[PDB]
Design a protein around this nucleic acid. Structure first.
Ligand SMILES: [Mg+2]
Ligand SMILES: [Mg+2]
Ligand SMILES: [Mg+2]
Ligand SMILES: [Mg+2]
Ligand SMILES: [Mg+2]
Ligand SMILES: [Mg+2]
Ligand SMILES: [Mg+2]
Ligand SMILES: [Mg+2]
Ligand SMILES: [Mg+2]
Ligand SMILES: [Mg+2]
Ligand SMILES: [Mg+2]
Ligand SMILES: [Mg+2]
Ligand SMILES: [Mg+2]
Ligand SMILES: [Mg+2]
Ligand SMILES: [Zn+2]
Lengths: 146, 120, 71, 50, 177
RNA sequence: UAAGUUUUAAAAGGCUAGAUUGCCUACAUUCAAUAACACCGAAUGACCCCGACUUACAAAAAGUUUAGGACUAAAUUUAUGA
RNA sequence: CUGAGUUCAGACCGUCGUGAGACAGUUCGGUUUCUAUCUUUGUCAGCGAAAGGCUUGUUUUGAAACGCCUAUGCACAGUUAG
RNA sequence: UACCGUACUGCAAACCGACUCAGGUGGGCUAGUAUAUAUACUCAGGCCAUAGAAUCAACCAUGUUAAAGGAACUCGGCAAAAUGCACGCGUGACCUCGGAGGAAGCGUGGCUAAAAAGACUCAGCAAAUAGCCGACAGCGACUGUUUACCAAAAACACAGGAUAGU
């Protein structure tokens, strides 16, 4: 619970200052809002890397201390994107990879059409609703309703 | 340990890159070891006067098995090599090539102590 | 790999000597309940003994101890 | 190939081969039934029931 | 075919080694949850050796010991018991935390059966011996332990009076931070 | 374990039976179900086994230790300098 | 242990034959079963009991143990067999 | 708006094999890493009953590793071992011009990097799955078929052609 609270405070401090904000100032920014929290830089780095691995913040190079940015000793700049991303990379690079994958999907479908097969695999439509999901919806509606 | 029908790289400029041991001179019926003379057959030539397919005499100078010494130390070589010999117990090669020519030898092989790049 | 004749009663008895069991020369007997077992084995009620009356152990007083029961 | 399992059961084939009506359809099948009767068999055909 | 008994090593117990270690972990967890379990002699002897290793690891009380026991010991209700009740119970015992009593043979296969239980608990079957035996300073053993480099190694309460003068101090509490 | 290391004389060396001679407080249970560990070992005046501690100058087989098992006794030690 | 060759069943080439076929003429391919009763042999083990008389050398309240020769057991075991 | 089926089993201890038999038995439905119904781990679900218990026999079966050699073994490299994968280069004769051919042979791969780069590891197709290659001949054009139970082949068939009859 404390780790959840500390990560939320690290995100809010990165959110209030919309500037690339490396580990040093995010540690100082979370500490300077009320030694209340974040006793060490290592704990703040562990929280920020976990937030980056869950696609809540991202990283960028640090000028004058680049040290090859994939080396884990490299200081990273944190930007704090507003919503949790569905993917991890730069959105322009993700869009380029999606276009390449979409063209590969068209090519595989065309090759499957020259052979005696369907373009895309045809699968039977299934039923996912049940008594448990209906009753779970009723419990959820009453829970928010109170 | 050099068994019969093995292969080894003759190192000198006598004209044989490789040879097959086809027999042992002494009553040593198991393996050959450094300092022993054996009958070898040249399988592949260097293109020069010793053509492929001759049956000459060779002394093994180094092996990939440990060569044990009396004090308790042993010498390990990363190659199994030999040097050709004549019918007078002398190498036909002008010099044992330094490409694989370092050994421990003082028994009557003083002629082989000048052909090698360095001993020991 | 096959018997050529039929084994006689005398030869069969001689061959079957390995099958017989040796008698045991010691037994541990409980004076109360009359139970019988080896001297290295518990044969009281915790083991199988429906005849045990507890008189086999004649003294067991241990009241005091102190610890943290984990709940 | 392991043998022994020549009998592959089927009710349609059993009734269609050794039933009453294929026995009655031909004359020599009717004398087969007649000598089954003369022997005294309790089950006349493979498909008889009551 | 490797020699395990006759050349001090672990028993094979008719099992592959991964099955063998998993079965011993299950049995040590069961041994500390219910303090007396009954099994065949070979599993009983192997359980006794494994119990000594696991109980000493719990007696260390360190974070690495907790991490190692977390994989070794399954229940988690009893990981707490090993690190707290068992560790305080045998804090000064130099090994031998378990006894073995033979109990005859079992009906299904006539295998020899042994009772394996933790010593020094209410409900044990033989009185324990004290782990330490306070020495007479007027005997030969104490003088041998003075001329030779041996510690006193006396019986002790859980918190001796040598920490009483630190804990009594009101300036050594830090308020609980 | 060998590919390693020793030894392979006249007669040497081994196996089985044994004249004799000597001795005798010897019913044979436990320490783990395949002692082959152990009879050229132990069973509490017991380190026999097991555990614990230490050793990189053993990448681990030795040293301390009666904690546990080989039960057992008192009017001078719940007990060996094990 | 193999079945490489000497027994087949398939096929081809050559010889002979009217032909079914034959060839110890050449080829390619083509089921090796058996859990040891007792006779040997290697090795590991079990069974093959004794107490005889002591007129007991002694004692009274020929019976009881004591003292003897050897009987088993155990140990070392011929200038001792095989 | 009647009549018949509705239990249980159905890759199996309930069917066909004398058996609670390692054999044979048709169709359909399906989650994630992930990407193919292949492969490794797992979801839903199911299972750990039909001899058990320890231990170091020899030997047998099935495998792992092995120093120096390496077909020297053997009727015969039989059996094992070895290549085994996606992106690049490349790439022989002979030939019915289609093929041979994935010829042969050599680089490049995991991990971190909103990213010009690097870390260390003995090892980065890191665990599981996915051709040994080249040459000289003989026979049969080819894919197929053949003695259920010792022979799958050069034997049979084949498209085509010739002959004879109609
Ligand atoms: Mg089949
Ligand atoms: Mg039948
Ligand atoms: Mg085995
Ligand atoms: Mg495994
Ligand atoms: Mg004890
Ligand atoms: Mg099946
Ligand atoms: Mg059958
Ligand atoms: Mg079946
Ligand atoms: Mg699985
Ligand atoms: Mg079972
Ligand atoms: Mg090698
Ligand atoms: Mg792989
Ligand atoms: Mg094909
Ligand atoms: Mg074919
Ligand atoms: Zn009783």
């Amino acid at each position: 619970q404390l780790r959840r609270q500390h990560a939320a405070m690290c995100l809010e401090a990165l959110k209030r200052a919309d500037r690339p904000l490396t580990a040093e100032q995010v540690h100082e920014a979370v500490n300077s809002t009320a030694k209340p929290v974040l006793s060490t830089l290592a704990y703040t780095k562990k929280l920020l890397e976990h937030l980056r691995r869950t696609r809540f913040v991202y990283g960028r190079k640090n000028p004058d201390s680049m040290l090859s940015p994939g080396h884990p000793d490299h200081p990273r700049l944190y930007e704090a994107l507003p919503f949790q991303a569905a993917r991890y990379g730069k959105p322009e690079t993700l869009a380029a990879a999606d276009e390449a994958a979409r063209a590969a999907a068209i090519a595989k479908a065309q090759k499957r059409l020259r052979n005696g097969k369907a373009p895309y695999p045809q699968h039977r439509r299934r039923a996912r609703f049940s008594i448990w999901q209906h009753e779970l919806a009723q419990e959820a509606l009453r829970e928010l309703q109170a | 340990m050099i068994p019969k029908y093995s292969f080894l790289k003759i190192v000198d400029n006598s004209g044989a890159k490789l040879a097959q041991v086809i027999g042992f001179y002494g009553h040593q019926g198991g393996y050959a070891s450094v300092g022993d003379v054996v009958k070898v057959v040249v399988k592949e030539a260097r293109g020069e006067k010793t053509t492929a397919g001759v049956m000459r005499k060779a002394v093994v100078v180094e092996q990939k098995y440990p060569f044990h010494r009396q004090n308790g130390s042993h010498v390990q070589y990363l190659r199994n090599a030999a040097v050709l010999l004549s019918e007078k117990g002398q190498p036909i090669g002008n010099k044992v090539r330094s490409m694989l020519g370092v050994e421990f030898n003082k028994p009557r092989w003083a002629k082989l102590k000048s052909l090698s790049k360095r001993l020991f | 790999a096959t018997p050529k004749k039929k084994l006689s009663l005398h030869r069969r008895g001689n061959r079957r000597v390995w099958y017989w069991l040796k008698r045991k020369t010691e037994v541990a007997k409980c004076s109360y309940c009359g139970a019988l077992s080896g001297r290295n084995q518990m044969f009281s009620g915790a083991a199988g003994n429906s005849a045990c009356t507890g008189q086999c152990v004649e003294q067991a007083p241990t009241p005091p101890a102190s610890s943290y029961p984990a709940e | 190939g392991n043998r022994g399992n020549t009998y592959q059961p089927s009710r349609r084939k059993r009734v269609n081969r050794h039933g009453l009506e294929k026995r009655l359809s031909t004359p020599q099948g009717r004398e087969v039934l007649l000598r089954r009767l003369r022997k005294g068999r309790w089950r006349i055909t493979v498909d008889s029931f009551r | 075919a490797r020699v395990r008994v006759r050349l001090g090593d672990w028993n094979r117990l008719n099992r592959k080694w991964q099955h063998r270690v998993s079965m011993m972990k299950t049995m040590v967890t069961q041994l500390l949850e219910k303090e007396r379990i009954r099994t065949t002699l070979a599993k009983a002897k192997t359980l006794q050796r494994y119990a000594d290793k696991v109980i000493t690891l719990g007696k260390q009380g360190t974070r690495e010991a907790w991490s190692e026991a977390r994989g070794i010991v399954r229940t988690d209700r009893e990981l707490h018991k090993l690190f707290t009740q068992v560790a305080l119970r045998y804090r000064e015992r130099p090994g031998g935390f378990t006894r073995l009593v033979r109990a005859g043979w079992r009906e299904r296969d006539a295998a020899p059966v042994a009772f394996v239980e933790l010593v020094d608990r209410p409900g044990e079957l033989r009185p324990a011996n004290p782990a330490l035996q306070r020495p007479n300073p007027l005997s030969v053993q104490a003088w041998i332990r003075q001329q030779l480099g041996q510690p006193a190694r006396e019986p002790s309460p859980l918190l001796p009076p040598s920490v009483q003068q630190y804990l009594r101090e009101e300036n050594r509490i830090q308020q609980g931070r």
